[PDB]
Amino acid sequence: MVQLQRAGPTIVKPGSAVKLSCKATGFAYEDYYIFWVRQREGGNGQKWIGRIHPGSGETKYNDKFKGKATLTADTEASSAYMRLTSLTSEDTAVWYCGWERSVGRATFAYWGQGTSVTVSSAKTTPPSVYPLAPGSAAQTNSMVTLGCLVKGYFPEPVTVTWNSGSLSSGVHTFPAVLQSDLYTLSSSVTVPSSTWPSETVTCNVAHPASSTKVDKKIVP
Amino acid sequence: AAITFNLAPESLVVTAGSKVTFSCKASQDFLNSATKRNYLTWYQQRDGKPPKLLIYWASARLSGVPARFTGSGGGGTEFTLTISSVKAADIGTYYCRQLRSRPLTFGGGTKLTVKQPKSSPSVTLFPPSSEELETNKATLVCTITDFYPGVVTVDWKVDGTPVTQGMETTQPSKQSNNKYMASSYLTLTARAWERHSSYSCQVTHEGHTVEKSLS
Amino acid sequence: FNVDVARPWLTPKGGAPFVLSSLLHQDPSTNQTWLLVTSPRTKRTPGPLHRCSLVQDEILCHPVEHVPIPKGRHRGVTVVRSHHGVLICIQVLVRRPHSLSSELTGTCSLLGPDLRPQAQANFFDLENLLDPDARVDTGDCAGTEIAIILDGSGSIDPPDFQRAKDFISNMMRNFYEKCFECNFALVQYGGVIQTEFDLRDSQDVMASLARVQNITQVGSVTKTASAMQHVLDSIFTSSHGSRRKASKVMVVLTDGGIFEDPLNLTTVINSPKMQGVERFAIGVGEEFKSARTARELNLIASDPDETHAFKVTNYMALDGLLSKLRYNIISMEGTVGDALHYQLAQIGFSAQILDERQVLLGAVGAFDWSGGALLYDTRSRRGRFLNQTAAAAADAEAAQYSYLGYAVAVLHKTCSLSYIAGAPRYKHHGAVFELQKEGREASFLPVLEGEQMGSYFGSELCPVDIDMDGSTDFLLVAAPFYHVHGEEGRVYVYRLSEQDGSFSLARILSGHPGFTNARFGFAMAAMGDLSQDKLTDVAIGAPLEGFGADDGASFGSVYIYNGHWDGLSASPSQRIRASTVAPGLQYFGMSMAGGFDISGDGLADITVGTLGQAVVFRSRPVVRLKVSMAFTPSALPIGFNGVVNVRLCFEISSVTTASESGLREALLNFTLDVDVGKQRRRLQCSDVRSCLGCLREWSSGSQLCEDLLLMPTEGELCEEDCFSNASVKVSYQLQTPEGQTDHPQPILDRYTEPFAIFQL
Amino acid sequence: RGQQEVLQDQPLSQGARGEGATQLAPQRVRVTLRPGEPQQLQVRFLRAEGYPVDLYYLMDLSYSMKDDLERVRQLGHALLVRLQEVTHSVRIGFGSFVDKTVLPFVSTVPSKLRHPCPTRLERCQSPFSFHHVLSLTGDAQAFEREVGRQSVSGNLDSPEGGFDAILQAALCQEQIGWRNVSRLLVFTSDDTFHTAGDGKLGGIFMPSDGHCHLDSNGLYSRSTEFDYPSVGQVAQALSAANIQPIFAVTSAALPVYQELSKLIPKSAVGELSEDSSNVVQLIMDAYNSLSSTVTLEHSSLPPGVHISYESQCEGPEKREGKAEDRGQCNHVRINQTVTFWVSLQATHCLPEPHLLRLRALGFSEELIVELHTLC
Ligand SMILES: *[C@@H]1O[C@H](CO)[C@@H](O[C@@H]2O[C@H](CO)[C@@H](O[C@@H]3O[C@H](CO[C@H]4O[C@H](CO)[C@@H](O)[C@H](O)[C@@H]4O)[C@@H](O)[C@H](O[C@H]4O[C@H](CO)[C@@H](O)[C@H](O)[C@@H]4O)[C@@H]3O)[C@H](O)[C@H]2NC(C)=O)[C@H](O)[C@H]1NC(C)=O
Ligand SMILES: *[C@@H]1O[C@H](CO)[C@@H](O[C@@H]2O[C@H](CO)[C@@H](O[C@@H]3O[C@H](CO)[C@@H](O)[C@H](O)[C@@H]3O)[C@H](O)[C@H]2NC(C)=O)[C@H](O)[C@H]1NC(C)=O
Ligand SMILES: *[C@@H]1O[C@H](CO)[C@@H](O[C@@H]2O[C@H](CO)[C@@H](O)[C@H](O)[C@H]2NC(C)=O)[C@H](O)[C@H]1NC(C)=O
Ligand SMILES: *[C@@H]1O[C@H](CO)[C@@H](O[C@@H]2O[C@H](CO)[C@@H](O)[C@H](O)[C@H]2NC(C)=O)[C@H](O)[C@H]1NC(C)=O
Ligand SMILES: *[C@@H]1O[C@H](CO)[C@@H](O)[C@H](O)[C@H]1NC(C)=O
Ligand SMILES: *[C@@H]1O[C@H](CO)[C@@H](O)[C@H](O)[C@H]1NC(C)=O
Ligand SMILES: *[C@@H]1O[C@H](CO)[C@@H](O)[C@H](O)[C@H]1NC(C)=O
Ligand SMILES: [Ca+2]
Ligand SMILES: [Ca+2]
Ligand SMILES: [Ca+2]
Ligand SMILES: [Ca+2]
Ligand SMILES: [Ca+2]
Ligand SMILES: [Ca+2]
């Protein structure tokens, strides 16, 4: 069967260039085309990039990426590449190589796993965890809500758990957002008021990019 | 130049076992005069997974796609992907795709969402943490959890005066229980935080405004 | 037929190369395929050769290094190719300094298969390369300016002065007789200095001579230095006809010394401009016996004073001085009316690579444009000239202006080679020559001749090897300017005997009827195998087809002939017209090449050369289908009135394309004709839809199948015929997408009937 | 059945001294045909007496023609007189050619471009492709004055570029002054001619185009950019312009120009003396032998149309029925009439009305036939 693999995520400073890869297996690498598409977040959907024919080295580019991308192929290694020049903070997106259907016409019949590119100048910074003490008015209700603020961390990701993962209900880990150049995140849990503060409530925040593990106990 | 797409609705609220119908329209004819086929393709993407091919030509399914999907959509400028009976595995985003001329373009996509009875948000407000103040930083966070539908707006007010700058709203997301959540931040300095005495957050939804406050 | 005209690739118009000829090449080691194109010299690109490849859906070109670089005008560029390498030739002009002639012959470069230089050859002074015994292997079983300063002082009485004028006139007449480049100026001096006529006036010899007799005597004091100064300032300048590189001479004619001259002699002679002027002093009269005037004369003249200074008893004696002055002033011009021979041989006019070392080059201008060919060994650097035997002088003159060597080609026989040449002007209708070898003596003889005057028979040659066994089977000879109404052209197909190598006409090919100006046959080429039957296929060009009609957007065509076991096709399988390729193409079809895979499909492609652009055409897969059908019941029992099951399966019987590709985007369209030929049919389709215009997408495999049902016709069946076999005809057809498609879509084999018949 | 009508049938007339010349009748005829049914149209041609003549003299000015030019300088008046015996309004012109100004055809050493003659004491001209000198005029004095102001030139190879001059004379109508009368071009030379393909020796690859390229002073300045005309191109241009060549060539070059004359439908060949002393008699003999041949030809027929001719030199002549493709009568005496029977039949019905032009070659007159069909 046909499958495509890729190098994986890459973090690069602004102004540099990156050479992605898309290995191919299970078919004659010099008989079919390889297409590239850029999927961006924030409702940007997808936009086609270009093509390359490994059997002849011939390329074609959408005008929007005419001077940005540069595709090439290696017949011996059966691996294609895209070169992005002068990357900017806007180029952050996930890119996909593809393989046109042999019969009929379907540009992307098979896709690779996925590769994500982030163009940031921020250094590897660990998170800062701040407990969210409930307001005095919330202590009179049957249900009490707690949480913590994972502010100031880069690069992604950070995994947040409660009570060393023993608690597994009521946890809401919202998607992170970027302030200035450094990310931010929050998480909110809910446990019965009859159990807090009568029982310990804590969270564990792991930031593998810095090998940092932080524990923060919630206090009124 | 490039062919443009209008894929509407941007999302569909559906229930298991109910017929569904997308629609996108192209600015130019897709009927290749020779083969008489319409060069439009349909894709499906599950959150966190690469897209997949469903229907290559306007009405031809790909091997492995369940029969409940149907291409239809003749005409050459209007197309409609129909599902006889939606199911849980079918919850995702669908893009239709130009295939006749260059540059090749997509339609933006349409996301399916399961229907649930209305649920008023559960709002909680937490003042800045003690330790944050020793760092000369301050921030106010309001959590809004378990609400339906997923459309809401929030307005922050310090001492009754709305503030329109220095806020970051976390992306609302969908849960397995068919509910939504959200959050908002209030970036402030320690000095700026002490300038005011009371704070409050406001929530807008299908009902009556819900608020919380601190002091 | 097989060529894809919907997807052409073109070199940018107004691009760096102004293509004159296009040519495909492939390095046998690395299997890299380039597109070599030629161009004339221009300020943008010095030329002459570029290698072009397919970069970004377009043809991009870079020049090839280590190739000769032309200077000035475009004299001619010639390029050929083989698996041994690439040969380049440029016509060059060398102006021999001594004489008023020119030499026009070629300078050549032989690159290897990968375009690395291997050898070079300059063909000026050819008699030093020649070898009248080299074995012919065939697998045997700025001019001269003169300024005269005439003294008009009154001491010369009018008779002596007419004699002086006669001396000047005779000097001019004599010098012009033996120095074609000489030019004259005349300054008469005395109390005043006076240009009789500068160097520009001397371009009309008769008028200048007339001006001499028209002179009038100034008759005053002798200001000689002022005369020299005025010649320096006014005669020897670019503003009055003088040329910088040309020699400069003076001839002073005085009868006395300087007296009352405002200027100074020693400063005038020593002046910066004087350096390089050959001053001759002619002294007349008794006064010169005195020492002072002798010193003045020895001072004006340039040493050796015996050959530049002069003295004569009286003005009559001047007539005798002509000999010494003519010897001492004008250098001998040398021979100029000699025969031509190899001076304008124009070697490299045509070319052919015989093997790694030997090349065959044309020599059209060899002997009064008699022509010939040079067999050059690029390693030993020695060559032999081959031409028609001169015999007596009466026959040698008859062979002048035949242009032998206009085109050269090689024929490959089962055991030996054979060189052929083209003589389009032979007997004013053309001919083709062939090298007959008899011991030492090898010479060209006519084998074929044209019929119409001015048709340029033999201007293009194309040996064709149909089954690619290494043995030529046909020879195509073009007469592009053949005339019926205007210049339509003609092509003669000649069969080669397998026993004697003789020629025998097989066919005469003409362009599409409807064009009076087509120039059909101007370019022909064997394009390898395009149709994918393993037989060679030829191409022919009609660059004027449609010229001047309507807006003149595009004109020219290319005909594609397919080869068969019995020879070339009778009629073309394709006709690519310039207007259907792209707008702006002028003279489409005057250069061609093929047989190398440039798109990446692995199938041989084509290149057609416009007069200013190049075009590359992608070849299409040729597909042959195999139709099989089954019946149930295998035969209809007598009185049967049920429904007949039919299983119809098509198959790709050609290995031209991988199975997984199928028919790509082409839909299979087939129809069924039940009980064909009967006035009233006995069976009919169960559903008319199911058997008329049935469109299907291929399964992506090597086979496709369908199931159909047939039912007896309504009403009672006629008794005339009740048990004859029922004929079912399955006519199929390929519907291919319109436009510009990424892959070359398949085309049904033209030479296989697109249907099959089965019986029940 | 078929039908046939007459729209203009103006009577034949030798024409008054002012106007009225008409040598072909009928001029407009409408034919309707049911395929398979033949119809016979009648045509008749009367040879007028004093029909005007325009003569253009095109002389090779190579060096071998130096003696020739001396005689031509003084034959203007006599040539005008002799033609005035046969016609009432004659006019004559002049032009010259040597060759293209590039190697190997012409020596490009600057001294030899300034002076191609062997020696520097004789009058010479720089080589040129073509030089129109005198437009057609009725004055012999202008001819004598302008021709006497010319001089000989020289080139390097024997064949000459006279085909350039012929094509430029055919194409440049307004410049040369051609009228709608009997046009005669007298091409006189001493050597053979260049033809398309030869220019490749000089580095020329652009074929000649059918445009007038004479500049403000009657010189083919752009000659080196284009290739020589082909024989077929020259024949086609002369036929379209209706010019009749008369090649007065020396004895050595006679066979070449006889072969060339065979290809051009109406032309004559004569032997020009080494001094060119017998040009007037040559022109007169050629002209008389050329005007006594009446030939009727058809333009390109529509698809499926067939045409045949049955020439008739005298009234009581037989009906031979031969299917010749072009009528022709020889030895037509002045003040006489002949008749051609043009037979027309068709195979397929046309999609729209078509038009034919049957013209007596060498004369302006023509006959437009409006051909239709029915079924
Ligand atoms: C095919 O190619 C061959 C060569 O491979 C040509 O043969 C040559 O022909 C030329 C003439 O066309 C020969 O030219 C030689 O010229 C020399 C100079 O002669 C000058 O003087 C005479 C008057 O005295 C002039 O007519 C002439 O134009 C020159 O100005 C002479 O030295 C030569 O004659 C002597 O040598 C020859 C050969 O040895 C002897 O036979 C003579 O008796 C005499 O001793 C000669 O005329 C040249 O020599 C030829 N070369 C060879 C190798 O034979 C063919 O002409 C060519 N065929 C065609 C059809 O073009
Ligand atoms: C699939 O192939 C069939 C082959 O029969 C196609 O049907 C044929 O289509 C052609 C082209 O339109 C028809 O020719 C035209 O028909 C009419 C009647 O004569 C007339 O307008 C024209 O002169 C012309 O001949 C043809 O009749 C028709 N049928 C047959 C039996 O040949 C069919 O169109 C193909 N499918 C598709 C989708 O194109
Ligand atoms: C260059 O192309 C030729 C022609 O396709 C190649 O020759 C083939 O080589 C393969 C093995 O690589 C053999 O199985 C085939 O039989 C050969 N084909 C023929 C027609 O002989 C050649 O190998 C290629 N060379 C390189 C270096 O890629
Ligand atoms: C000779 O006859 C031709 C053909 O009749 C004339 O061609 C005319 O040229 C003018 C140029 O302005 C056109 O407007 C006319 O339509 C053409 N045809 C006719 C019938 O007039 C040509 O003018 C005539 N020449 C002379 C000198 O009278
Ligand atoms: C010089 O020539 C001119 C012009 O032809 C003439 O008038 C004059 O008389 C001539 N002078 C002499 C001295 O012959
Ligand atoms: C010119 O000057 C030189 C150098 O001073 C002198 O010897 C000579 O006599 C001078 N001649 C004249 C004619 O004045
Ligand atoms: C032709 O014949 C007619 C008869 O009337 C005559 O008037 C006219 O002059 C003719 N030509 C000659 C030369 O007689
Ligand atoms: Ca063979
Ligand atoms: Ca073939
Ligand atoms: Ca190919
Ligand atoms: Ca001559
Ligand atoms: Ca003469
Ligand atoms: Ca010449």
Coordinates of C-alpha atoms in Angstrom, one line a residue, chain D residues 46-194:
Chain D
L46 CA -10.6 40.4 -80.9
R47 CA -7.0 41.5 -81.3
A48 CA -7.0 45.3 -81.4
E49 CA -4.6 47.2 -83.6
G50 CA -2.9 50.0 -81.6
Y51 CA -3.0 48.6 -78.1
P52 CA -0.7 50.6 -75.8
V53 CA 2.6 49.1 -74.5
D54 CA 4.6 49.7 -71.4
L55 CA 8.2 48.6 -71.6
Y56 CA 10.6 48.3 -68.6
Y57 CA 14.3 47.7 -69.3
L58 CA 16.1 45.6 -66.7
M59 CA 19.8 45.4 -67.5
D60 CA 22.6 43.5 -65.8
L61 CA 25.3 45.9 -65.0
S62 CA 28.0 43.3 -64.2
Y63 CA 31.5 44.2 -65.5
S64 CA 31.1 42.0 -68.6
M65 CA 28.3 44.4 -69.6
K66 CA 30.5 47.4 -69.9
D67 CA 30.4 47.3 -73.7
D68 CA 26.7 46.6 -73.6
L69 CA 25.9 49.7 -71.6
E70 CA 27.6 51.9 -74.2
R71 CA 25.1 50.9 -76.8
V72 CA 22.0 51.0 -74.5
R73 CA 22.9 54.6 -73.7
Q74 CA 21.9 55.5 -77.2
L75 CA 19.0 53.1 -78.1
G76 CA 16.2 54.9 -76.3
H77 CA 15.0 57.0 -79.3
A78 CA 15.3 54.1 -81.7
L79 CA 13.4 51.7 -79.4
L80 CA 10.7 54.3 -78.9
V81 CA 10.4 54.8 -82.7
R82 CA 10.2 51.1 -83.5
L83 CA 7.5 50.4 -81.0
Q84 CA 5.6 53.5 -82.3
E85 CA 5.2 51.6 -85.5
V86 CA 2.9 48.9 -83.9
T87 CA 1.3 51.0 -81.1
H88 CA 0.1 54.5 -80.7
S89 CA 1.1 55.2 -77.1
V90 CA 4.3 53.5 -75.9
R91 CA 6.4 54.4 -72.9
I92 CA 9.7 53.0 -71.6
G93 CA 11.6 52.8 -68.3
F94 CA 14.8 51.5 -66.9
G95 CA 16.4 49.7 -64.0
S96 CA 19.5 47.7 -63.1
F97 CA 20.8 44.9 -60.9
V98 CA 24.1 43.2 -60.0
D99 CA 23.9 41.1 -56.9
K100 CA 23.5 41.0 -53.1
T101 CA 26.2 42.9 -51.2
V102 CA 27.5 40.1 -49.0
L103 CA 30.1 37.4 -49.4
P104 CA 30.5 35.1 -51.4
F105 CA 28.4 36.9 -53.9
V106 CA 30.2 40.3 -53.7
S107 CA 33.6 41.2 -52.4
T108 CA 33.2 43.1 -49.2
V109 CA 36.7 44.5 -48.9
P110 CA 35.9 48.2 -48.5
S111 CA 38.0 49.2 -51.4
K112 CA 36.2 46.8 -53.7
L113 CA 32.9 47.9 -52.2
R114 CA 33.8 51.4 -53.3
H115 CA 35.2 50.2 -56.6
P116 CA 34.5 46.7 -57.8
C117 CA 36.1 47.2 -61.2
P118 CA 39.5 45.7 -61.8
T119 CA 41.3 49.0 -62.2
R120 CA 41.0 52.4 -60.6
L121 CA 40.9 54.6 -63.7
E122 CA 37.5 53.6 -65.1
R123 CA 34.1 54.7 -63.8
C124 CA 32.4 52.3 -61.4
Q125 CA 29.4 51.9 -59.2
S126 CA 29.1 50.2 -55.8
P127 CA 27.3 46.9 -56.1
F128 CA 23.5 46.9 -55.4
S129 CA 20.7 44.4 -55.5
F130 CA 18.3 46.5 -57.6
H131 CA 18.1 50.1 -58.6
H132 CA 15.0 51.6 -60.2
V133 CA 16.2 54.5 -62.3
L134 CA 13.6 55.9 -64.7
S135 CA 9.8 55.5 -64.2
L136 CA 7.9 54.7 -67.4
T137 CA 7.6 57.8 -69.5
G138 CA 6.9 58.6 -73.2
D139 CA 10.1 60.6 -73.6
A140 CA 13.2 59.0 -75.2
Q141 CA 15.3 61.9 -74.0
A142 CA 14.8 61.1 -70.4
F143 CA 15.8 57.5 -71.1
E144 CA 19.0 58.6 -72.9
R145 CA 19.9 61.1 -70.1
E146 CA 19.3 58.8 -67.2
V147 CA 20.8 55.7 -68.7
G148 CA 23.9 57.7 -69.8
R149 CA 24.4 58.7 -66.2
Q150 CA 24.9 55.0 -65.1
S151 CA 28.1 53.0 -64.9
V152 CA 29.1 49.4 -64.6
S153 CA 29.7 47.5 -61.4
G154 CA 31.1 44.1 -60.4
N155 CA 30.6 41.1 -58.2
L156 CA 32.4 37.9 -57.3
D157 CA 30.4 34.9 -58.6
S158 CA 29.0 34.3 -62.0
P159 CA 25.2 34.0 -61.2
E160 CA 23.5 37.3 -60.6
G161 CA 20.7 38.5 -58.4
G162 CA 18.3 39.5 -61.2
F163 CA 15.3 37.6 -59.7
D164 CA 15.3 40.1 -56.9
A165 CA 14.9 42.9 -59.5
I166 CA 12.1 41.0 -61.4
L167 CA 10.1 40.4 -58.2
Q168 CA 10.5 44.0 -57.0
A169 CA 9.5 45.2 -60.4
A170 CA 6.4 43.0 -60.4
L171 CA 5.4 44.0 -56.8
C172 CA 6.2 47.8 -56.9
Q173 CA 3.4 49.0 -59.1
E174 CA 3.0 52.7 -58.2
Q175 CA 6.8 53.3 -58.1
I176 CA 7.5 52.0 -61.6
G177 CA 4.4 53.5 -63.2
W178 CA 2.7 50.5 -64.7
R179 CA -0.6 51.1 -66.5
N180 CA -3.4 48.8 -67.3
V181 CA -2.0 48.0 -70.7
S182 CA 0.3 45.4 -72.3
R183 CA 3.2 45.1 -69.9
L184 CA 6.6 44.0 -71.2
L185 CA 9.7 43.5 -69.0
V186 CA 12.9 43.1 -71.1
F187 CA 15.4 41.2 -68.8
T188 CA 18.8 41.3 -70.4
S189 CA 21.8 39.5 -68.9
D190 CA 25.0 37.7 -69.7
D191 CA 25.1 35.0 -67.0
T192 CA 22.8 32.7 -65.0
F193 CA 20.8 33.7 -62.0
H194 CA 20.6 33.0 -58.3

